[PDB]
């Protein structure tokens, strides 16, 4: 008989919350041997909002690509600052004379192939065009892959992430299991911040407030995430590994 | 009624204001009026 | 919640003298309903009012008031 306007909000005083570092220490353990690029983090932000109100339908461009459908690989000098930069942009197996043998292996993880104008010489020397050709991945002037600015090329082909507000929660994948605590941390900042902006400009009659945010993996428990980032265990420091 | 008395607040944050009437089914008023506190013409915007 | 609520009486302080069961042991100080002490305990000499003068003679302070023990047994 009776009805309620706002979605039910549960008291959070009891909730044991975890810092991002401490939280990852648990999720990484459950995902001990799973493929690192198939297991992806995800966030469930609970918004205190009315039922008959509008819903968010904006997008976001995260610092690092999440969707793995388009796996990028950059042919750049080895050990160069750009080689590591490619990893920051989300590159896979990028570098010099690192995939060239993979192109000879006959199995390619990457779905697309970039070759910086500087490394163009090594490409012809490799003489692997006859192998990349039939696959439709051979760079060319018309391929728009021989570029001097990698970051710009990355933002163009990847795109953006779409998040839609459902009944009472916004759900979107933010990180990949192979993310470092620094990368994943910033990736979340760009997420909750963008929501706050949209929520801010949405309307003032009934502003929506983020009640709780839950972090979970594909095969991990949904744990409440605390604003803190540093680990509570003094002995344990930020560790990075597969 | 069909008419409402709106208040245009000074954007100079001086507290001065003007009061005009306009139909309800109309856009909020926004005019360039004279502020006697600063003695200059500033932008006045509807309160609500 | 509000800034003003209905005024209530928390009871009267009394010291047991007969080791009443379900309430407390002998010489136990606590607050009890004014009705039980006035109609049942005091006439039967089972307890005594803890007046400010009584606190001085016994040497105790006002901070020695306990609570009723419903689980007490002889």
């Amino acid at each position: 008989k009776k009805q309620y306007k706002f979605f039910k909000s549960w008291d959070l005083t009891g909730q044991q919350q975890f810092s991002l570092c401490d939280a990852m220490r648990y999720l990484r353990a459950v995902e001990v041997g799973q493929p690192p690029l198939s297991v992806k983090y995800e966030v469930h932000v609970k918004l205190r909002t009315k039922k008959n109100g509008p819903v968010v339908r904006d997008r976001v461009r995260l610092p690092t690509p999440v969707k793995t459908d388009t796996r990028i690989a950059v042919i750049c000098p080895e050990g160069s600052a750009l080689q590591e930069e490619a990893k920051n942009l989300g590159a896979v197996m990028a570098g010099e004379e690192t995939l060239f043998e993979a192109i000879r292996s006959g199995n390619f993880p990457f779905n697309k192939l970039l070759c910086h104008t500087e490394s163009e010489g090594a490409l012809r020397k490799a003489n692997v065009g006859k192998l990349l050709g039939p696959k439709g991945l051979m760079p060319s002037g018309k391929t728009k892959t021989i570029t001097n600015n990698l970051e710009a090329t990355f933002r163009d082909m990847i795109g953006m992430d779409e998040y839609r507000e459902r009944n009472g929660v916004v759900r979107m994948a933010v990180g990949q299991l192979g993310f470092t605590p620094k990368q994943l941390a910033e990736n979340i900042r760009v997420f909750m911040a963008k929501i706050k902006s949209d929520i801010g400009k949405l309307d003032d009659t009934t502003p929506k407030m983020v009640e709780e945010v839950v972090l979970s993996t594909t095969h991990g428990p949904g744990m409440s995430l605390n604003a803190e980032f540093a680990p509570t265990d003094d002995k344990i420091k930020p560790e990075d590994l597969e | 009624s069909r008419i409402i008395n709106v208040r245009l607040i000074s954007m100079a944050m001086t507290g001065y204001f003007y009061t005009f009437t306009r139909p309800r089914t109309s856009l909020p008023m926004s005019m360039l009026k004279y502020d006697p506190i600063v003695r200059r013409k500033v932008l006045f915007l509807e309160q609500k | 919640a509000s800034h003003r609520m209905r005024l209530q009486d928390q009871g009267v302080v009394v010291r047991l003298l007969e080791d009443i069961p379900k309430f407390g042991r002998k010489h136990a100080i606590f607050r009890i309903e004014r009705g039980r002490m006035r109609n049942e305990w005091f006439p039967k000499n089972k307890a005594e009012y803890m007046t400010p003068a009584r606190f001085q003679e016994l040497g105790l302070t006002r901070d020695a008031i306990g609570e009723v023990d419903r689980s007490f047994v002889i």
């Binding site: 648990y26 590994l241 597969e242 | - | -």
Partner: protein, 195 residues
Amino acid sequence: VGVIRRLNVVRELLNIRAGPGAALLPKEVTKVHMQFAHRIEEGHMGPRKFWRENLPKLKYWNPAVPMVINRTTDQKGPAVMTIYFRDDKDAKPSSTPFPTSSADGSSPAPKPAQGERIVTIDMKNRNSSVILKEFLDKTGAVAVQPTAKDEEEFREFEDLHRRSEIDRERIRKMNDAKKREKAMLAKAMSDAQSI
């Protein structure tokens, strides 16, 4: 769903730090690379349970030890375990290359580097307990002891499982009669509504 509903779930699932197969490996070990098949045929059940029961606990207490697992669809394969126990005599110089877990033989056991005299382990048709035993003793880890509250956690949830199953049968039985009665009356009356 409530805050306490989920807490009782995650906390229970938070047995990664518990008794069975939990220890702090010495500083001499750097990483490990296991390799088994998907199915359990041909002595492949043992290695799997170790990966889903005990191995997850080793990562928590020692999260700086890469533990990659390669999977293959070619059963009757090498079900071995290469424990990078050396660390080049506690030498900091790191070996750049190391693969990552996957599903189809993408990461074969990498060959040891110069200062990488490693000890291997075999496991086929062998119980996980035997695998775990040889793992701890050979690696030389110091088992962690669960504190009081940890042992309290087991006791609490153990009672929940009692009441839980006690409620499963009840609500299941209450639905047994409901579904049964609804079918009997339906089989009786509606059989006439067919006409």
